[PDB]
Amino acid sequence: EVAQLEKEVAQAEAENYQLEQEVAQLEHECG
Amino acid sequence: EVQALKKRVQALKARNYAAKQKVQALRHKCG
Question: How many CA atoms lie within 13 Å of B17's alpha carbon, on the beta-carbon side?
């Protein structure tokens, strides 16, 4: 369902947003 | 669009999958 996919996209987006923050930080401190 | 959101999910998961590995790789590298 559209609603299901939307909650799934929002799920991925939420994680994605965090992953990029952590990667940027970890790289900024290490990389 | 269902088909549209599905590709959104896949695109996100594709980036999420890569980012997740990066975060954990970075946690190993400098965690």
Answer: 6
d(Cα B27, Cα A13) in Å, to the nearest integer? 21
Chain A residues closer than 8 Å to B13 by CB: 12
Query: How many whole angstroms separate alpha carbon A26 and alpha carbon A23?
Result: 5
Delimit the domains of chain A by residue range.
Answer: 1-31
Q: How many CB atoms lie within 10 A of CB B9?
A: 19
| Cβ contact A31–B26 (<8 Å) | yes
Q: What is the DSSP track for A1-31?
A: -HHHHHHHHHHHHHHHHHHHHHHHHHHHHT-
